[PDB]
Design a protein around this nucleic acid. Structure first.
Ligand SMILES: [Mg+2]
Ligand SMILES: [Mg+2]
Ligand SMILES: [Mg+2]
Ligand SMILES: [Mg+2]
Ligand SMILES: [Mg+2]
Ligand SMILES: [Mg+2]
Ligand SMILES: [Mg+2]
Ligand SMILES: [Mg+2]
Ligand SMILES: [Mg+2]
Ligand SMILES: [Mg+2]
Ligand SMILES: [Mg+2]
Ligand SMILES: [Mg+2]
Ligand SMILES: [Mg+2]
Ligand SMILES: [Mg+2]
Ligand SMILES: [Mg+2]
Ligand SMILES: [Mg+2]
Ligand SMILES: [Mg+2]
Ligand SMILES: [Mg+2]
Ligand SMILES: [Mg+2]
Ligand SMILES: [Mg+2]
Ligand SMILES: [Mg+2]
Ligand SMILES: [Mg+2]
Ligand SMILES: [Mg+2]
Ligand SMILES: [Mg+2]
Ligand SMILES: [Mg+2]
Ligand SMILES: [Mg+2]
Ligand SMILES: [Mg+2]
Ligand SMILES: [Mg+2]
Ligand SMILES: [Mg+2]
Ligand SMILES: [Mg+2]
Ligand SMILES: [Mg+2]
Lengths: 206, 262, 152
RNA sequence: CCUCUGGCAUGUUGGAACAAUGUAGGUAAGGGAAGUCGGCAAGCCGGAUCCGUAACUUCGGGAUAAGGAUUGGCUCUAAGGGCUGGGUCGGUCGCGGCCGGCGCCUAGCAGCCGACUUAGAACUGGUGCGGACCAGGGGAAUCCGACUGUUUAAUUAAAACA
RNA sequence: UACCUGGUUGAUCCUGCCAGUAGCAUAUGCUUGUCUCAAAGAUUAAGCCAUGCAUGUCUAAGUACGCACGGCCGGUACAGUGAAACUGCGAAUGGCUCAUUAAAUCAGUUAUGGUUCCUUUGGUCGCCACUUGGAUAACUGUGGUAAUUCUAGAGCUAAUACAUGCCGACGGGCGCUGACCCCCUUCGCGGGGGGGAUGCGUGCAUUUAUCAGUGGUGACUCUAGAUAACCUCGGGCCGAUCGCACGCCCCCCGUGGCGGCGACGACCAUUCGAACGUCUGCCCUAUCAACUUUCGAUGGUAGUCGCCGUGCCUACCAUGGUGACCACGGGUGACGGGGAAUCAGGGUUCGAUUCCGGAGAGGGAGCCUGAGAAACGGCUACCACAUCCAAGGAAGGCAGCAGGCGCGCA
RNA sequence: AUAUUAAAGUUGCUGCAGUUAAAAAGCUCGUAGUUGGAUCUUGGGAGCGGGCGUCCCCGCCGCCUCUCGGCGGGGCCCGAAGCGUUUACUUUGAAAAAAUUAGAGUGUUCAAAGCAGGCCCGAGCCGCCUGGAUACCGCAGCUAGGAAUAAUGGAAUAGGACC
RNA sequence: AGAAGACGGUCGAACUUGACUAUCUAGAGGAAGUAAAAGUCGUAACAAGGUUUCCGUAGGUGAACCUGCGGAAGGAUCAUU
């Protein structure tokens, strides 16, 4: 078939090898998943020794972990932004390991408003007036206020992230192998890496 | 080899099975099991070659399949069930009970034992574990995943397992001044107290063992297997005591038995 | 810049370069809390690894690569491959009929972590076998010597 | 080949027909030089990029040898350049200067400009794409004269002369 | 036994060969009373194959309403044989042959801390459940085709086949959340201590991220644990399962509990392995001296695929990699080895051939199932041979065992 | 008949030739290759054992370490470590499929084979006594001893130790 | 739940068409070699072989050969005052 195996290529010295037998079902490959953005479409695959490889062909959501604040809500994978293997895979919106995607900030927003009791994503007075006041409004006092006072300079979120939230899309690096596992579970770009990819993205745009 | 192998040529069979050239092209091939194929006494051989209890392959079958044979306390109707080292085979309708403990050649001597003694066995620990929720394990030499050991056993200690209940009932630690049988290579079925162990990091650990009768040797830890604290062991031993006469000494002892004794 | 000379971001794995909200500037003095390990067999992890800032997944100190099985020496012969060196192991092969030997030289392509600086050529270099990590390369360099002849 | 500037009235006439013969163009089923003194005539080939290139040889050539593939439209990607900018802190003098001290991008980074090419990729069309124009048919051998050159204005361009 | 004789000369001593001498296989000639063993289509043609046989299988314990037998008993399904057919497993072993294949296979050596593993053994296995849904095979009955181990339509009918799916379980236990409530102190904000309804989770496995460093090793990014979530969604998983033999006892009468096997599964260890890797080793050849490389050559970075580790493949970079220590190319009357023949000591030649390992089923290629094949006594194509056809179509592979043809000294 | 080995020291490592029998480049340089002079701890010392002393034999003078572990101060010397400067070399050990070979035992009637056999016993024993050895297994890889031979190092525009 | 089907991808037999390479062969004519043999021409060589032979290199000749130049002793002089 479409075989992974050294037998078919030249030696370190450079001379030709010879085929001492025919191909072997294990000296095997398969055609690539190259899973896209879209509403879920997965295929399972019988592999060696029984077992199953759950090949994503389309995908939409993913379980991305904001590391620094520790929340890891499920979210949309809105779009692919950058992929340092090959540009065309950005253009296609093909999802791979170490793809830089975008994800909606909304569950991280919801979480941060919950946790630190602060607004995230600046606005005039539309989100702040009805919902955040209701999230606040301390009928207990004493205990909960002391807690969220203890959530101190500690809230002080990164600048680059804060901008992304107020826009609404977070750059997130995929850690899973979508074609193999099926999922697209990754993590949010933060600080040094984020700054690096943002620059690489700026350079790409020209 | 398109998959696995389901046969075993005679001649290609293990040497210590005593299997002769003309009889058949094949040997049984022990079933998959606790012991390694090339470390076994396939129940059939143990009977119709070494107890003469059956004549044929068919006769062993018929002995086995009245549920007469009882390999480390259970019952097994496979004729090719690999019995091996420190096991039992209780045969019941006779009250024989054996053990399979190596000879100083290295052949598993048909070693009769008492019905008390035939309760416990002995086992080498292969690997201590820690599985889920912190619950530790052992694994014996003969594939008994024990769970919850005395937090002290670690690898190469030997244990006295019950059998019928299962579970560990006290043990021996691998150290100098402990009786060591070897279960592999040149010095198979020799026994002496230890003396000295030598850790080679990455390579494997050479171990010296001094026989009762002044003689000494070495081995690689794997084959080694302790059987008690110092001179006194924790089991029966076949006559010979795992002591390894020189070929000259053996010939003399054979010569002295002849003519005089009768 | 400097370290990130590549298209994707290079980081050591196994550390999370982020958790921070306290006084005394942004991050610590060492800044990135470096990952490293010791390789064993009494091979001393170098200062250039632990003090050093570089990254390399195939470095047997500062990355995913166990050392296992055969350990040898060679002598550094070509340094041109990036992160790697060819080394010449030489030996005396016995013919029996003629009760003599012959020289024979196998030359192994070998991974050379950037922890090692000042590796001239002609430099005897211990290598420890590992899992393969290139078509041809399995052996990482573990300790280096140089002193056979020219200078410290 | 088509166009503007400028220039003309189709080259000493017009009209109506659309026969044969012609002159100048084209096209032809099946065969493919059977035609003929003789492939004469016409046809094939043709650009570019990428491969690939024999005998022979004066070693320079032969050579665009031969023989192959690709070519459009559309939407993208990558690769190739210039200019200018830090002397920031302190002092003092009139955003600018002068002095002293740091800095000293000495891996450079930042902003502002501007031709044009080359490679790669997607999609797309009734496989069409060097769409007209332009633009080698090759091969094996023999004879002659080395070659480039010259020659009978008006029947001989050659192997003749040089 | 570390053995030499004949032959150049008119004769001599030599170099030197030829010729004899002794083994060992293959053939062949002549010949052959007895007996124990015993090779045998390798060499030529991995040439072609008439016929037949060479892989099937049922226990007490997976589904029996064939009506094919019979029970002993009726009527409470079932009782005992049981072809049939569905179900499961096996068909990857064995057997053959040596075409290929020259650092390849192969041997010793190690690694898998870079993976898969049917089984075997041992661990794990907290409102349809007094047990649910519909489907089909045999059996029945109409057929169609010239012809095949072709099959369609109609009737039914079971399952451990295929599906669906609950009681358990403690409004209770532990994480977060916390309507709130209570005690102390304080001028009071505040500070400290407690308790606490209502919510969400209320994990073995999966995928990702963070934290901490029970048991381990030359050796962790190991095991184990904690937090955050995710479900590789019906085609993640066990979650929670059918069958057989005895037949027992309830502070109690119609119920509720009970031992002994079978079979089944997700995970972990074991075993049988497999697979890739490490080191060192192979015959002739220079009338093979340079080879490899944008069609992967050697490295790097990030992926892709794969059971996993690697140019395995893709992108982007770097310009490496092998060579007189013989690369690279060519040949082999070349499968590797264990081993065999000779032999004083060295050696030389052989090794198709009963063990081990490889490779192949005319040739090439592709795949289905399956734990395991790139299977050939499995398919799908093509090429080469060839077989019936009612000429539309249909079928085929002895390098299994016999046997045939051919080739051939064999 | 032919293949092949010994004969063939007519392929030569052991082990041949090269004045004239076949045979040494016309000559010199010359890189790979191969081959390379001498040189560093020794006599002695002290005992057990053999033929007051002499001549032959046998354990000792692996050093340092105590920076490390222990079989409010310590000893005692073992695990670790400056591992043997870094190899070759040699010896021991460990690992090595079986069959074949070599080779123990054993009257297959003998033998080539085979792996068995043998007894007590009137059988009353209702059996018993034994085998199914060892050797070899290039090279490479692994272990510990030895340190002559041969390489290979270190202190020379200076460096070893020292509350 | 899902059959036939088609877009593209992929592995890729197979056939055509070159191309290079190994083995095998037909060939007028040419030109060698060996062998038979009861030929023909001469006599080069071995004796100072009747011109020492021989080597290298040139040219020539029916043929062996001859001649030129520089070598050789394997010479017909180890020696010449
Ligand atoms: Mg020799
Ligand atoms: Mg006109
Ligand atoms: Mg006009
Ligand atoms: Mg005019
Ligand atoms: Mg025409
Ligand atoms: Mg004509
Ligand atoms: Mg004609
Ligand atoms: Mg013309
Ligand atoms: Mg031409
Ligand atoms: Mg001519
Ligand atoms: Mg001319
Ligand atoms: Mg003219
Ligand atoms: Mg003219
Ligand atoms: Mg004569
Ligand atoms: Mg002869
Ligand atoms: Mg087989
Ligand atoms: Mg395994
Ligand atoms: Mg051949
Ligand atoms: Mg075989
Ligand atoms: Mg055939
Ligand atoms: Mg096969
Ligand atoms: Mg096949
Ligand atoms: Mg067949
Ligand atoms: Mg010979
Ligand atoms: Mg001889
Ligand atoms: Mg000679
Ligand atoms: Mg001569
Ligand atoms: Mg000379
Ligand atoms: Mg010397
Ligand atoms: Mg005559
Ligand atoms: Mg002569």
């Amino acid at each position: 078939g479409i075989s992974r195996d050294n037998w078919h290529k030249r030696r370190k010295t450079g001379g030709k090898r010879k085929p001492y037998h025919k191909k072997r079902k294990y000296e095997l490959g398969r055609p690539a998943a190259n899973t896209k953005i879209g509403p879920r479409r997965i295929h399972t695959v019988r592999v060696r020794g029984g077992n199953k490889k759950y090949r994503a062909l389309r995908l939409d959501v993913g379980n991305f972990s904001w590391g620094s604040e520790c929340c890891t809500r499920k979210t949309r994978i809105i779009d692919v932004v950058y992929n340092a293997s090959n540009n065309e895979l950005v253009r296609t919106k093909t999802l791979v390991k170490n793809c830089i995607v975008l994800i909606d900030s909304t569950p991280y927003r919801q979480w941060y408003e919950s946790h630190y009791a602060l607004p995230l994503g600046r606005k005039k007075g539309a989100k702040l007036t009805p919902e955040e006041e209701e999230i606040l409004n301390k009928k207990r006092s004493k205990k909960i206020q002391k807690k969220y006072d203890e959530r101190k300079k500690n809230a002080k979120i990164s600048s680059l992230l804060e901008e992304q939230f107020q826009q609404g899309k977070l750059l997130a690096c995929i850690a899973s192998r979508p074609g193999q596992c099926g999922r697209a579970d990754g993590y949010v770009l933060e600080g040094k890496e984020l700054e690096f990819y943002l620059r690489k993205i700026k350079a790409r745009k020209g | 080899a398109r998959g696995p192998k389901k046969h075993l040529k005679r001649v290609a069979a293990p040497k210590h099975w005593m299997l002769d050239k003309l009889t058949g092209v094949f040997a049984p091939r022990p079933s998959t099991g606790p012991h390694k194929l090339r470390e076994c006494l396939p129940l059939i051989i143990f009977l119709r070659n070494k107890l003469k209890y059956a004549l044929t392959g068919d006769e062993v079958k018929k002995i086995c399949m009245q549920r007469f044979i009882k390999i480390d306390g259970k019952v097994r109707a496979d004729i090719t069930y690999p019995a091996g080292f420190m096991d039992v085979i209780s045969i019941d309708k006779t009250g024989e009970n054996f053990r399979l403990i190596y000879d100083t050649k290295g052949r598993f001597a048909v070693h009769r034992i008492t019905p008390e003694e035939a309760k416990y066995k002995l086992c080498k620990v292969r690997k201590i574990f820690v599985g889920t929720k912190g619950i530790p394990h052992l694994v014996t030499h003969d594939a008994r995943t024990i769970r919850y050991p005395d937090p002290l056993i670690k690898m190469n200690d030997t244990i006295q397992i019950d059998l019928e209940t299962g579970k560990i009932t006290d043990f021996i630690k691998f150290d100098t001044g402990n009786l060591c049988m070897v279960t592999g290579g040149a010095n198979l079925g020799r026994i002496g107290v230890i003396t000295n162990r030598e850790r080679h990091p990455g390579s494997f650990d050479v171990v010296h063992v001094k026989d009762a009768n002044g003689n000494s040797f070495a081995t690689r830890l794997s084959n080694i297997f302790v059987i008690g604290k110092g001179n006194k062991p924790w089991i029966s031993l076949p006559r010979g005591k795992g002591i390894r006469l020189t070929i000259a000494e053996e010939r003399d002892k054979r010569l002295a038995a002849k003519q005089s004794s009768g | 810049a400097d370290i990130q000379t590549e298209r994707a971001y290079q980081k050591q794995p196994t550390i999370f370069q982020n958790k921070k909200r306290v006084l005394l500037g942004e991050t610590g003095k060492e800044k990135l809390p470096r990952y490293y390990k010791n390789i064993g067999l009494g091979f001393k992890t170098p200062k250039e690894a632990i003090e050093g800032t570089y990254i390399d997944k195939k470095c047997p100190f500062t990355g995913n690569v166990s050392i296992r099985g055969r350990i040898l020496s060679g002598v550094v012969t070509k340094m041109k491959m990036q992160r790697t060196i060819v080394i010449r192991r030489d030996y005396l092969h016995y013919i029996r009929k003629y009760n003599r030997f012959e020289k024979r030289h196998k030359n192994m392509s070998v991974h050379l972590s950037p922890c090692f600086r000042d590796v001239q050529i002609g430099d005897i270099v211990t290598v420890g076998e590992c899992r393969p990590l290139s078509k041809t390369v399995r052996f990482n360099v573990l300790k280096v010597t140089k002193a056979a002849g020219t200078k410290k």
